[PDB]
Amino acid sequence: SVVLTTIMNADQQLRYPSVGELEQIKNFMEDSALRLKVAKTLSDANDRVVKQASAGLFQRRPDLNNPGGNAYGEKRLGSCIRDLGWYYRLITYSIVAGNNEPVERIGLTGIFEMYRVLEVPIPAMIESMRLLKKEALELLSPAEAEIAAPYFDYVIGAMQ
Amino acid sequence: SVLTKAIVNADAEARYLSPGELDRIKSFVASGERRLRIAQTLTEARERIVKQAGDQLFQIRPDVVSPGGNAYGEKMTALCLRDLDYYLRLVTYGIVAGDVTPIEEIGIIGVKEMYNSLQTPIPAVAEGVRAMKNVATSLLSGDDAAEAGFYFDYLVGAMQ
Amino acid sequence: SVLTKAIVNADAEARYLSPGELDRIKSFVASGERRLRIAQTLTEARERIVKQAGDQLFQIRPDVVSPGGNAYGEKMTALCLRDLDYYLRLVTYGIVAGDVTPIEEIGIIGVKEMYNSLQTPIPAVAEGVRAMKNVATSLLSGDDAAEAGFYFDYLVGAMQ
Amino acid sequence: SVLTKAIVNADAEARYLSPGELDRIKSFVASGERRLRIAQTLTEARERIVKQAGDQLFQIRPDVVSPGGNAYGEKMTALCLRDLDYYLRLVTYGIVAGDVTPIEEIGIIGVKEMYNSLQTPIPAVAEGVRAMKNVATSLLSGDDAAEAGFYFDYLVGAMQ
Amino acid sequence: SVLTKAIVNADAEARYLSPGELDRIKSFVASGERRLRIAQTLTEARERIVKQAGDQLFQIRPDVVSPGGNAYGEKMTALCLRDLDYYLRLVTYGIVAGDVTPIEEIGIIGVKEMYNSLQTPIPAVAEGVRAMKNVATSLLSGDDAAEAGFYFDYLVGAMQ
Amino acid sequence: MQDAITAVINNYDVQGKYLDGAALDKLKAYFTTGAVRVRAAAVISSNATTIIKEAAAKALIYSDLTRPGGNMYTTRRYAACIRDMDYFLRYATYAMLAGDPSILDERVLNGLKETYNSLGVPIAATVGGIQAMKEVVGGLVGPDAAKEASIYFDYLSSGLS
Amino acid sequence: MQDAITAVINNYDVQGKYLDGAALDKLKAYFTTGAVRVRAAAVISSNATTIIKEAAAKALIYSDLTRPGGNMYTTRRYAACIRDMDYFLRYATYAMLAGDPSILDERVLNGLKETYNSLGVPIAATVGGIQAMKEVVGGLVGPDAAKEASIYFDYLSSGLS
Amino acid sequence: MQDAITAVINNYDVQGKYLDGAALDKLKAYFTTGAVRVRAAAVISSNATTIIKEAAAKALIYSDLTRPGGNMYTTRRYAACIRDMDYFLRYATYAMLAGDPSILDERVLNGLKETYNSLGVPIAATVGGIQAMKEVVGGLVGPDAAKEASIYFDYLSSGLS
Amino acid sequence: MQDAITAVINNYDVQGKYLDGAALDKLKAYFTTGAVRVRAAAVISSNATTIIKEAAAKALIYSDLTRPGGNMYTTRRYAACIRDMDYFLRYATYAMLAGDPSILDERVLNGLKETYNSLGVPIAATVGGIQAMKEVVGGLVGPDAAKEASIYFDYLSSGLS
Amino acid sequence: MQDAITAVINNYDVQGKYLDGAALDKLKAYFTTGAVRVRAAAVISSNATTIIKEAAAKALIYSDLTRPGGNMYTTRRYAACIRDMDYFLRYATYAMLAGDPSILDERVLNGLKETYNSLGVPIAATVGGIQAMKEVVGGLVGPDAAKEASIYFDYLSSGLS
Numbered sequence A: 001s002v003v004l005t006t007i008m009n010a011d012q013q014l015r016y017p018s019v020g021e022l023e024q025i026k027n028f029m030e031d032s033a034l035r036l037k038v039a040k041t042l043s044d045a046n047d048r049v050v051k052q053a054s055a056g057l058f059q060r061r062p063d064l065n066n067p068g069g070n071a072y073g074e075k076r077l078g079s080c081i082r083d084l085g086w087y088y089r090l091i092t093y094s095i096v097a098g099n100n101e102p103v104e105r106i107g108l109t110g111i112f113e114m115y116r117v118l119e120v121p122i123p124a125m126i127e128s129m130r131l132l133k134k135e136a137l138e139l140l141s142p143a144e145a146e147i148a149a150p151y152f153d154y155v156i157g158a159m160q
Numbered sequence B, C, D, E: 001s002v003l004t005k006a007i008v009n010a011d012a013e014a015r016y017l018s019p020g021e022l023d024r025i026k027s028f029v030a031s032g033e034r035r036l037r038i039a040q041t042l043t044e045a046r047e048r049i050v051k052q053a054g055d056q057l058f059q060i061r062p063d064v065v066s067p068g069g070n071a072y073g074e075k076m077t078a079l080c081l082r083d084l085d086y087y088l089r090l091v092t093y094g095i096v097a098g099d100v101t102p103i104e105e106i107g108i109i110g111v112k113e114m115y116n117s118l119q120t121p122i123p124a125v126a127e128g129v130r131a132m133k134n135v136a137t138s139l140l141s142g143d144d145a146a147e148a149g150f151y152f153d154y155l156v157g158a159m160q
Numbered sequence F, G, H, I, J: 001m002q003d004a005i006t007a008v009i010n011n012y013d014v015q016g017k018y019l020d021g022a023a024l025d026k027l028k029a030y031f032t033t034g035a036v037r038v039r040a041a042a043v044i045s046s047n048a049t050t051i052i053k054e055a056a057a058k059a060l061i062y063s064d065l066t067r068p069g070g071n072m073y074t075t076r077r078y079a080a081c082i083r084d085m086d087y088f089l090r091y092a093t094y095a096m097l098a099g100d101p102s103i104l105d106e107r108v109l110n111g112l113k114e115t116y117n118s119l120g121v122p123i124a125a126t127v128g129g130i131q132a133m134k135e136v137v138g139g140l141v142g143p144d145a146a147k148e149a150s151i152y153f154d155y156l157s158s159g160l161s
């Protein structure tokens, strides 16, 4: 989280938190009251947004469910949908957390090294998270959309 | 500043600006109006603040203005008041910047060596900064007084 | 208290409490919880505040414990500390009441003739009260510190 | 309004406005939008309120529309209805103002003398006002109903 | 101003503003920026203009600063320079107004009586105004120099 | 005079004691009933004159008091008695708001019994009128304000009698 | 009478100071708002008479002012209107050409209440007539220039009442 | 005295109209600036004595005023002059809070000119002191309320001079 | 590196002055232009890769750089581009977030001409590629935020060439 | 390391559970109190050396530790013990800010026990110094953060012992 990111820098430089660092640590909490319902709203759709994004993604890329495709079969499709659910859970975790910490530390550092022995399309995950961000914002208002858009941008900005 | 501390931090990893960093930069630009107003209010009353802080300092530590004192004499006292004005200027710079980065480079790094060479009481200078903090917080509303005094306490802690 | 000096004004005109008076008589009861908690907090640390206030008072004005001093001797400084405890009790009373009304009756009206007959230094007692203010605001949150500092400053100003 | 009442007391005591008075003004300006909403609703629904309050007052005391009654006749009753409209406008003004200075200066001072001169039943007028109270509180939410009804009860008390 | 001289001129005939007067008002509002810039330029250099003009005047007419002179002595010379500064201020007022209406009422009507009572040489004051005109025209471009100088010649002619 | 908050303060000030836990509990007990007192005060203020009318109707008028030989006979004495009822109602409201009968003892009950006996005023009739007012006030306020409303009326009646 | 240009100079002259930044900002603001004023003055002119007729129909006529007893019952009382008006126009067209109240206080709105009180002339009616012309001129003049004309008309109405 | 809200209400009541869009926009125009006014008033109240001290130092004392023959000579006259400065500052604060110089007209400038002429007080020196206080207040409050604060000090100065 | 906030402080500290009106106006301008910059930074991010591909297709590819002999002829020379780029993005997105040339002169555009001269790397080609990215980002970002992004891209291209 | 927030995230990610009402309750309970954590951390940072001074004066020095044969004897060992003092204070502040002793376990208690055993450090003396730290910090920060500060000092003392 933000506290972890600040304390890591402080301990790396061997010093207390800074006079501009506490101003950010306090501003990270005052919007937490609003943000709690923002990440909450995506929480009770978690088995629905991914379910719809399957219908947004494997018709866009039909080779994912074609004989030369990686997601042929009901169980193979289930794996891709479970991966989408994992990414949705992680992005919600980071939304509740602050900085990129929850997603980067768990399911972002080593995507290419995983898929290197997995044969799963990174350019397909690009559109997958594009559609996830596309469908997860209309549940929110524009005020919440402004507090949700950058949190969605990091996946398609990192895997690239 | 906050912008420098945020952009260069997301440049040491070869990534774009973090979705966690497309925030507190935001609160900084939001509170920039209040920061500018507070800095202007401190700047208008620079002479009165310096004069009263020097008065309080010379009462509380009268040994410095004695014959065996570093600041004994009219022009050695003028130099002490000039140093107090310098630190008030640095505090205003820190307030506008939103971080103690500029004040740190301008008037803190090596201050121990400089004052040891000149044979000046660093605890006396710290007490002068505290008196300046009291006089400054006497001229401001509670929130703005706390905001200015937080930087003043940074100066007091650093000169230590 | 706010209660006593709002029925008195209504009775001075011989009317009922006004619409604009029955709403100001509600904010005080709302802040009564905070006032009671602050007074209990100050009451818990009554001896430490008294002892430290006496220490800073004697350091600032050692003439009172000089041979040509009113409080010269162990019993004379004991009486000074007892007066300090009295004034701290009055400040707690003012904080709970929400106005300065009880403290004026108990320990301000006639204090000039008090310490003139007893030959006690008013500026010395005022400095002791200010040391109490510092020690007390050292043990409180910022808003509560300001609320208690209001009554401490009133006592200092009235002893003048 | 609340501003005028605070300023009058401050001028009477020859002192600037207290922090409590400033907090009261801040709360009043916070409640301004709600006060405007209640006033707008009553203004939009005034005519029906007037007609129902008139019917309620008449069937509570039909003697006023009797041969020996003050309001006997079409043009004699139109004046009573216009008076009820007048006090409804006054209570809307009091709602927007926040306290009863405009109502006091417009419709209750000298009202006893005026109605004694006109030989109109003041207690009957009070019951007619209470009918407006019921009809108006029937068109508002609970706390808005309490807010408007407080001014209505003020008018009822000021009548007698 | 021109607006005053135009609107009141079309008010003595009981008509609206003439189509012949829905002009040069327009030229005045068009040249308002230039007039404001010229007035600010003169105001910025008020001390240099006054000092040099007084120098030239005292060289041209040394009798006034002689023992039998009206302006003999350091404070009598200070008063002469103050009068010159007053007339420079009036010239700037005329420039901004676009007409000599304000300077006429402020410092021309009755000036003959005042200076005759004080026994001051009106031709000497006129020469001082001419010196101020020369110094002012030395600091301006040709068009702006002519524009300010025309008011200067108005003052010179009026003091006559 | 003192309110419920400056009454505990005066108790702890004549002993030199600080505000211990019991004082905090007492002040909490007062603070928890703040809003109901204000609402009851507003209700009595808005319904004052009707209260006096019903109290007089139930207790005083339609008797020998308003007849010749009574102490309510003649318009001047009737107006004086109704003004006294108005004053009693207003000071009862003040005492109920302050949570203390100190104002009642200080500004109503001092010298009132001897003034009434020096004038011939029937104290029993006064107490009956105050009780009728207490009944009407308890009826108007509701369960929330009835008991603490009635305690100050019974305080006034006990001080008079 | 004063405009903005003269008002700033008069205010800065009694205290004897040169024109500083604040004065140059006020004069600059007037100079920037110097074309819409001129255009709206011409718009108020020409269509003056229709403005007066529409305002009269909207506020004055169709009321007690025309029936027997009113202060516009007959002609010549009707004729004192259109006149009476044409002032409140004319003036305040002067105001929104040399924008400052000043003229409206010195020439039109000064002792007018005394004259009306001595001549009858319902002040509430003649203020409703002013607001009617305010509406009609706001309609005719335009979106942005509807304001400051509304300002001067409101000043006239408020000062009269 | 009257403020923005009461001024709107009165200038609609005297014409007998209801709250329309213009008055509503005026009232939200006052409402939007509520926080700035109260913050500036709190700052002025906290720094009241320092403002008077600095204004007196800049404009009055250390001159012929405080020497014999000056009006501000003697302790009685010095105390009266600083009391007058406090008067002007406090009433300017009230006017800034209410958004209306009506309080200044009713309770400050009425007869002040003739009173000062009778007492021999230097009116020009008083206006200079008021302007020094205005400068100090504008320094303390900041651009947020500097203009609103300055307009009422300027109103006081223009009324006196 | 420096932003506007740091630049004003640095060139006001070397001369030892407090922040005056001009410095406040510059900081005011940056603070007012502080939201479109943040939005356009996020817009540039995510759509970065398509921006690079469009710029490459528009300027670099379909030219001498792809046939045998070119500096993008084979793979890994095509790979050193997209890389090389992603800088000139990344940087100048930093510039249009902490707006000042500074970063572009200290980190990216400094000795780059020497490196390209020692490694081949057609500078005219790599600046035409910069202008293609400028056009595509001006298209994607918006009407007003297309400028200052054009400013930093022009600074990069001009400095490189 | 972890704080309260990331501790909740990891504790739910281990079983793959979305954030529920209980988890959001824990996050709310952490968020509602961290502002006092920020103030306490600022106070501790501003008074770091003073806290070490009073803790050493109360618990370590004026004893056999500073005399010959003591562990704190000689300036080298004195500086080592005070650096350890400062490190304990800083890591306690980090733990109180994060609301979790995970950082204390990972970077403080790991290897410290048998390290002190191999170096001859008196663990009882270090524990006494840590508790003196906690006493001074509780005195400084006040009731708001006293127990939150003291719990992690107790954690350090219990881990060492």
Ligand SMILES: *C[C@@H](*)[C@H]1/C(=C/c2[nH]c(/C=C3N=C(/C=C4\NC(=O)C(CC)=C4C)C(C)=C\3CCC(=O)O)c(CCC(=O)O)c2C)NC(=O)[C@@H]1C
Residues within 6 Å of the ligand: D064, D070, D071, D076, D079, D080, D081, D083, D084, D086, D087, D106, D107, D118, D120, D121, D124, D125, D128
């Ligand atoms: C519910 C109506 C009761 C009633 C009323 C009644 N009123 C009149 C006449 C007038 N009433 C007013 C009132 C006001 N002027 C004000 O300024 C205000 C407050 C802003 C008020 C309330 C006035 C001025 C008049 C005079 C006539 C007029 O102004 O046009 C009359 C007529 C009297 C008559 O007997 O001729 C009546 C009857 N009568 C009832 O029975 C109702 C209870």
Ligand SMILES: *C[C@@H](*)[C@H]1/C(=C/c2[nH]c(/C=C3N=C(/C=C4\NC(=O)C(CC)=C4C)C(C)=C\3CCC(=O)O)c(CCC(=O)O)c2C)NC(=O)[C@@H]1C
Residues within 6 Å of the ligand: F060, F065, F070, F071, F072, F076, F077, F078, F080, F081, F082, F083, F084, F087, F088, F107, F108, F115, F119, F121, F122, F123, F125, F126, F129
């Ligand atoms: C139901 C009423 C009974 C009654 C009363 C009565 N009272 C008077 C006269 C006075 N009453 C008062 C009252 C007060 N003084 C106070 O300070 C207070 C509380 C603050 C009160 C209530 C006083 C001072 C007087 C004397 C002066 C005066 O009249 O104002 C009278 C008049 C007696 C007479 O005629 O001389 C009456 C009748 N009488 C009854 O029969 C009822 C039981």
Ligand SMILES: *[C@H](C)[C@H]1/C(=C/c2[nH]c(/C=C3N=C(/C=C4\NC(=O)C(CC)=C4C)C(C)=C\3CCC(=O)O)c(CCC(=O)O)c2C)NC(=O)[C@@H]1C
Residues within 6 Å of the ligand: F061, F062, F063, F066, F067, F072, F073, F074, F075
């Ligand atoms: C009759 C023509 C009018 C009328 C009268 C009315 N009166 C009452 C009640 C009372 N009237 C009095 C009167 C007096 N007491 C005195 O000392 C004197 C002076 C000699 C007078 C005139 C009193 C005391 C009462 C109260 C009851 C009692 O006498 O004990 C009522 C009853 C009111 C009620 O609420 O019950 C009425 C109706 N009513 C009319 O309509 C006539 C105009």
Ligand SMILES: *[C@H](C)[C@H]1/C(=C/c2[nH]c(/C=C3N=C(/C=C4\NC(=O)C(CC)=C4C)C(C)=C\3CCC(=O)O)c(CCC(=O)O)c2C)NC(=O)[C@@H]1C
Residues within 6 Å of the ligand: G060, G065, G070, G071, G072, G073, G076, G077, G078, G080, G081, G082, G084, G085, G087, G107, G108, G109, G112, G115, G119, G121, G122, G123, G125, G126, G129
């Ligand atoms: C018309 C909407 C209302 C009205 C008016 C009315 N006015 C008069 C008479 C006069 N009105 C004026 C007015 C002015 N003189 C000025 O100098 C100015 C400002 C520049 C004004 C506004 C005066 C002086 C008179 C008397 C002399 C004259 O007529 O010129 C009358 C005539 C009254 C009579 O018959 O004696 C009337 C009727 N009447 C309405 O009904 C409207 C409310």
Ligand SMILES: *[C@H](C)[C@H]1/C(=C/c2[nH]c(/C=C3N=C(/C=C4\NC(=O)C(CC)=C4C)C(C)=C\3CCC(=O)O)c(CCC(=O)O)c2C)NC(=O)[C@@H]1C
Residues within 6 Å of the ligand: H061, H062, H063, H066, H067, H072, H073, H074, H075, H078
């Ligand atoms: C001297 C023993 C003490 C002392 C004095 C002190 N005074 C001033 C300034 C002023 N004192 C006066 C006094 C008077 N004006 C009157 O009309 C009378 C009655 C005859 C008196 C006594 C005034 C008007 C001033 C203001 C300046 C002026 O005269 O123009 C100062 C200067 C304070 C400052 O801030 O500049 C001082 C120091 N100070 C001590 O410590 C002594 C105990």
Ligand SMILES: *[C@H](C)[C@H]1/C(=C/c2[nH]c(/C=C3N=C(/C=C4\NC(=O)C(CC)=C4C)C(C)=C\3CCC(=O)O)c(CCC(=O)O)c2C)NC(=O)[C@@H]1C
Residues within 6 Å of the ligand: I060, I065, I070, I071, I072, I073, I076, I077, I078, I080, I081, I082, I084, I085, I087, I107, I108, I109, I112, I115, I119, I121, I122, I123, I125, I126, I129
């Ligand atoms: C692409 C449009 C053009 C092009 C480029 C090209 N570049 C290289 C190699 C390097 N480029 C860099 C660049 C940078 N280092 C920095 O630090 C920065 C700023 C932060 C820049 C811009 C460097 C240092 C190298 C050399 C080391 C490396 O490769 O990382 C090559 C490879 C050359 C080779 O084969 O040896 C190429 C091809 N080629 C084109 O056709 C365009 C004109």
Ligand SMILES: *[C@H](C)[C@H]1/C(=C/c2[nH]c(/C=C3N=C(/C=C4\NC(=O)C(CC)=C4C)C(C)=C\3CCC(=O)O)c(CCC(=O)O)c2C)NC(=O)[C@@H]1C
Residues within 6 Å of the ligand: J061, J062, J063, J066, J067, J072, J073, J074, J075, J078
């Ligand atoms: C005396 C000329 C100066 C001075 C000294 C001073 N020292 C202390 C306290 C201590 N000094 C030591 C010293 C040493 N420990 C070692 O191992 C060695 C090397 C052999 C030395 C020299 C220690 C350990 C202490 C702490 C107390 C203790 O010994 O247990 C003080 C007291 C400070 C306090 O805050 O109490 C003082 C004053 N003071 C002067 O003014 C001289 C310049």
Ligand SMILES: *[C@H](C)[C@H]1/C(=C/c2[nH]c(/C=C3N=C(/C=C4\NC(=O)C(CC)=C4C)C(C)=C\3CCC(=O)O)c(CCC(=O)O)c2C)NC(=O)[C@@H]1C
Residues within 6 Å of the ligand: J065, J071, J072, J073, J077, J078, J080, J081, J082, J084, J085, J087, J088, J107, J108, J109, J112, J115, J119, J121, J122, J123, J125, J126, J129
């Ligand atoms: C001080 C209150 C007590 C004391 C201490 C003491 N410590 C050492 C040496 C070391 N202390 C450490 C400590 C740490 N390593 C870590 O990672 C952390 C937390 C992040 C800590 C606290 C280490 C590594 C050493 C060894 C290396 C070094 O000296 O820096 C000494 C020196 C022992 C010697 O002389 O060899 C001492 C004296 N001594 C006392 O008397 C106190 C009870």
Ligand SMILES: CCC1=C(C)/C(=C/C2=NC(=C\c3[nH]c(/C=C4\NC(=O)[C@H](C)[C@H]4CC)c(C)c3CCC(=O)O)/C(CCC(=O)O)=C2C)NC1=O
Residues within 6 Å of the ligand: G061, G062, G066, G073, G074, G075, G078
């Ligand atoms: C005693 C002399 C006299 C008269 C007559 C007079 C008339 C008069 N007619 C008016 C209106 C009006 N008069 C009429 C109509 C008519 N008028 C006629 O004489 C015809 C019979 C009829 C048309 C066939 C209409 C339609 C209006 C409304 C204004 C308008 O036309 O727009 C008005 C304006 C106020 C109002 O609307 O009532 C006046 C003053 N005043 C006087 O002093």
Ligand SMILES: CCC1=C(C)/C(=C/C2=NC(=C\c3[nH]c(/C=C4\NC(=O)[C@H](C)[C@H]4CC)c(C)c3CCC(=O)O)/C(CCC(=O)O)=C2C)NC1=O
Residues within 6 Å of the ligand: I061, I062, I066, I073, I074, I075, I078
């Ligand atoms: C010796 C190793 C090597 C190869 C092979 C190579 C290929 C190569 N093909 C390219 C483009 C391209 N290549 C193709 C097409 C094809 N590509 C094929 O291997 C198929 C035969 C065919 C599809 C059937 C197209 C269409 C483009 C243009 C870019 C685009 O597809 O948008 C480019 C980019 C530059 C350009 O546009 O010319 C490279 C790097 N470069 C190398 O260094």
